[PDB]
From a paper:
2-Oxoglutarate (2OG) and Fe(II)-dependent oxygenases couple substrate oxidation with 2OG decarboxylation to give succinate and CO2; they have important functions in human biology, e.g., in hypoxia signaling, extracellular matrix biosynthesis, lipid metabolism, and DNA/RNA damage repair. The human 2OG oxygenases studied, factor inhibiting hypoxia-inducible transcription factor HIF-α (FIH) and aspartate/asparagine-β-hydroxylase (AspH), catalyze C3 hydroxylations of Asp/Asn-residues. Like AspH, human factor inhibiting the hypoxia-inducible transcription factor HIF-α (FIH) catalyzes the post-translational oxidation of Asp- and Asn-residues in a 2OG-dependent manner, however, to give the β-threo hydroxylated product. FIH was initially identified as catalyzing hydroxylation of an Asn-residue in the C-terminal transactivation domain of HIF-α isoforms (Asn803 in HIF-1α), a reaction that suppresses HIF-mediated transcription.
FIH was crystallized in the presence of Zn(II) and the 2OG derivatives 11 or 18 to investigate their binding modes. FIH crystallized in the P41212 space group (FIH:11, 1.99 Å resolution; FIH:18, 1.90 Å resolution). Clear electron density corresponding to 18 or 11, respectively, was observed in the active site; 11 and 18 bind FIH in a similar manner as 2OG. The analysis of the electron density maps for the 2OG derivatives indicates that only (S)-11 and (S)-18 bind FIH, even though both were present as racemic mixtures. The conformation of (S)-18 in the FIH:18 structure is reminiscent of the NOFD conformation in the reported FIH:NOFD52 structure, indicating that these molecules inhibit FIH by a similar mechanism: their bulky phenyl substituents extent into the FIH substrate-binding pocket and appear to shield the active site metal from the substrate and/or O2. In agreement with the proposal that the coordination of (S)-11 and (S)-18 to the FIH active site impairs substrate binding, FIH crystals with both inhibitor and substrate-bound could not be obtained. To investigate the mechanism by which the synthetic 2OG derivatives inhibit FIH, the concentration-dependent effect of the potent FIH inhibitor 18 on the 2OG Kmapp-value was investigated using HIF-1α788–822. The 2OG Kmapp-value decreases in a linear fashion with ascending inhibitor concentrations, while the vmaxapp-values converge, indicating a linear 2OG-competitive inhibition mechanism. Using non-linear regression, the Ki-value of 18 was determined to be ~0.2 μM. Notably, 19 inhibits FIH more than one order of magnitude less efficiently than the structurally related, but conformationally more rigid, NOFD (note that NOFD was used in the enantiopure form, while 19 was used as a racemic mixture). However, the potency of 19 was increased when replacing its C4 benzyl- with a 3-phenylpropyl-substituent (IC50 ~0.9 μM; Table 3, entry 11).
Numbering used by the authors:
A (entry chain A), B (entry chain A): 15 to 349
The structure:
Amino acid sequence: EPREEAGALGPAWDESQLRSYSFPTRPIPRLSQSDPRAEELIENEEPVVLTDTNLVYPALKWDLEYLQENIGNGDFSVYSASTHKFLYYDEKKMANFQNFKPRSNREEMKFHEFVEKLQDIQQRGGEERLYLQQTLNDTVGRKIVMDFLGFNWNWINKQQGKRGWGQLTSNLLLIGMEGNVTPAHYDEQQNFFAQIKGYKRCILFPPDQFECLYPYPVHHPCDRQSQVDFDNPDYERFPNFQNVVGYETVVGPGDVLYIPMYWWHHIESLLNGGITITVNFWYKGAPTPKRIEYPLKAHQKVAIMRNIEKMLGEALGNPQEVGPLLNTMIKGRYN
Amino acid sequence: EPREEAGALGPAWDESQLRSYSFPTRPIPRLSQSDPRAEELIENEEPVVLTDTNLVYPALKWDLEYLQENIGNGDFSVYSASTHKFLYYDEKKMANFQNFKPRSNREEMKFHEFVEKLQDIQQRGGEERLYLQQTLNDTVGRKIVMDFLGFNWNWINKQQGKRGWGQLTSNLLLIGMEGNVTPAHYDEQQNFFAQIKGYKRCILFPPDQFECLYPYPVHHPCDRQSQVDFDNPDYERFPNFQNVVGYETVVGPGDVLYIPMYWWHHIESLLNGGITITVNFWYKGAPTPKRIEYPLKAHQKVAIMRNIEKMLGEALGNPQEVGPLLNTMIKGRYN
Ligand SMILES: O=C(O)C(=O)C[C@H](CCCc1ccccc1)C(=O)O
Ligand SMILES: O=C(O)C(=O)C[C@H](CCCc1ccccc1)C(=O)O
Ligand SMILES: [Zn+2]
Ligand SMILES: [Zn+2]
């Protein structure tokens, strides 16, 4: 249920701002950084919302005005779409599927250009949607550097150390419009997802729900994203989506959501909730141990399947032949 | 059609001695060793019957009396079954499938014991069937050594050399009763199949008919054998068996059938044709070239599928989990 803002400022959000879906959910725990139960959830690669890390405390003051003045004059990737759904696609893989035409369009622009194009849309009451998704890098101005340096590296570096993770891979800055949706997908890195402005509903599914969520082929541009349209699920093609069960939370400013690697997550910016701002923190997972303990975890079986698809594509010389060979291998033999 | 024996001794066999099956066939070429077309078929890994190799010329005099006196006192593997079908099973794999109970029983016996047990059956008019299948080895007596040494090694060694094959792996001695059937299966080695006594109908299918012939799982004891019962094909489980097309021949004494590696073959001893005797010659195939030429041959795709099954069984720690993972990989994704 919705949390209540300090100073009797009312519920920060209400249930009318959440989209409606076909499956049930149960809440992700919201705990203090100091709560041993939080450390045990992270250790066991289960999601948890930490309410008091201060991980991005200097960025809580961020808004569009502030960022435009200080984020510098680098290029920012901005996606545009006529739908609320911003399905990720990997442009390096579009050669394998020359029949895939994305629904989002990516435009590289300056931050002020992003603010203006967003202003124009608001002014003319258009229905075009934008989502800025850009890795933070050296081109940011001095006050963003100062803010970045003031993140709680003491806390997150200890996490990284305790869990045996690899190095921080990148931080993604995410600025979306109310109602934007990033469809369900899993990532191969560990993620601390730090909410800065506005509210995002996060729906996670464990790796053992692979069978219910139907990822695209590995060589397709939408590798790791679900094929299922959550707004109109096709149960004839995706029957096990009728068994899917999620873990849900709404993060607001100050919250940090641990999204364990291989966990599926669907992310939406709350309807009529204004713009959202988030920064994520991606780490490579801990190395695979030399001695493999059986039984294997769910995410290890996902990794085996990915590797089988990649090797078959290499061996056959063409990723389009992956599906026919696999069918030939199973029909009348393993089904 | 049936060939005619020299000296106006009539057709050696007639069509009434062949079992009846559901698919069509066309003949395998019968050619002279000296015929360039024969060399081109072998070079292109296509079956051919060579009528004049003299490969096992000293063994053409072999019968049960002769062999019993001279084959020595080693152990011979003899299979018994209540059916005409002698489905091969690999005893080293029976641990993976503790629910598989063979229909053939293997008994290790002396050759005279084989002749006697065969006599008893004939005497009492029983319907029990035997099939002796034994690798030739050092225990054979001097006259079999002399016979073996007189095979046409000049011709077969040149074949082995020309084709880049590996070393002769083994020679299998095969002594079966009229009507015995070895069900359809493929082998991973190259085979020169030398007929000595009686007549065997050989039905081959190219490796690109994998999809029509439904081999057992790699880790099952009947790895490489078809699951399809040729006498009662289940078209609901094995629908593509309705598209299978074979290449057929009847080999008699003096004939040598080249069975290329990965080619499926079904072998039957002709009804009411007496005992049959055969010796095969298995060679490892030529090494896989360093530079892989695309497109891949059918047998190369079979080998990829085999390797995928073997690695998945190793990675998962249990061959029983191979089928569920493969289904999970394909359902709603590649089918
Ligand atoms: O931080 C995460 O991991 C998220 O999923 C946040 C998500 C945007 C992700 C865009 C994307 C999708 C697939 C691959 C790489 C990038 C959002 O907040 O809308
Ligand atoms: O020479 C061949 O290759 C044959 O198929 C001949 C065949 C008996 C083969 C028995 C067997 C089946 C599977 C694996 C190893 C051995 C016959 O003539 O009845
Ligand atoms: Zn993600
Ligand atoms: Zn064989």
